[PDB]
């Protein structure tokens, strides 16, 4: 249902804090589950003659996951020396998406554009990418459909690198 990257993304979103160090994050039970699962994939992918310890594979998996997120601009490295991540970009992106989706539904809009540059300017996040915004909206839309089945029947997201196109289909009750 969701990629390993987005599972870690959801864990970060739920943490009741604005920042977290690499070491504190790696100690979270939920994080270890995701990491262990990815590590087993990395073990299978090792080339012939290559056999690293599982622990080594887990640390490599964890680094790959965090780097994928930082790379999409979903979270930032607020401090390199202490390896502390800034979680505000992620939480602000989710707030932005939730509000956008909310207003679109209230106006019964079936198709609307979300321009990447607008999101970058609005939240002062130059590093956010379209793939990052897509995953944030997918998660919010998934939650919206679950919480408001009388309003949101179905949804789709199309690509327009300049932005995304949200498609919303409404349920009978809302009309």
Q: What's the rounded Cα separation, in Å, for the pair 141 and 157?
A: 10
Last residue of a domain, one of 87, 113, 130: 87
CA distances from 102 to 122, 151, 174 (A): 17, 11, 14
- Under a CB-based contact definition with an 8 Å cutoff, are residues 78 and 90 in contact? no
Coil, helix or strand for 171? coil
Same domain, 12 and 83: yes
User: For residue 141, which of 85, 102, 89, 90 has the smallest C-alpha distance?
Assistant: 102
What is the layout of strands, in order, in the sheet containing 111-115?
111-115, 163-170, 152-159
Same domain, 76 and 120: no
Resolution of the experimental model, in Å, one decimal: 2.1
Domain count, the chain: 2
For the chain, the straight-line distance linking the first and the last C-alpha, in angstroms and rounded, comes to: 29
Tell me the H-state helices in the chain: 4-14, 22-26, 29-45, 54-71, 88-106, 116-123, 130-147
Same domain, 71 and 132: no
Same domain, 102 and 162: yes
Same domain, 105 and 143: yes
Same domain, 27 and 1: yes
Same domain, 3 and 78: yes
Same domain, 114 and 80: no
């Amino acid at each position: 249902r969701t990629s390993a990257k987005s599972n870690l993304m959801l864990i970060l979103l739920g943490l009741q804090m604005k920042e977290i160090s690499n070491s504190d994050l790696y100690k979270l039970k939920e994080v270890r589950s995701v990491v262990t699962s990815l590590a087993s994939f990395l073990f299978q992918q090792q080339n012939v003659g290559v056999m690293k310890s599982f622990d080594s594979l887990e640390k490599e998996a964890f680094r790959d996951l965090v780097n994928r997120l930082v790379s999409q601009g979903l979270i930032g490295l607020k401090d390199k020396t202490s390896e502390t991540f800034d979680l505000l970009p992620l939480k602000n992106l989710f707030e932005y998406a939730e509000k956008r989706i909310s207003v679109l539904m209230k106006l019964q809009c079936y198709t609307g554009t979300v321009q990447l540059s607008h999101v970058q300017e609005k939240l002062h996040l130059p590093y956010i990418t379209t793939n990052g915004i897509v995953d944030v909206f997918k998660e919010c839309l998934k939650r919206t459909k679950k919480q408001y089945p009388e309003v949101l029947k179905n949804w789709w997201i199309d690509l327009d690198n300049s932005g995304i196109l949200l498609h919303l289909e409404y349920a009978a009750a809302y009309s």
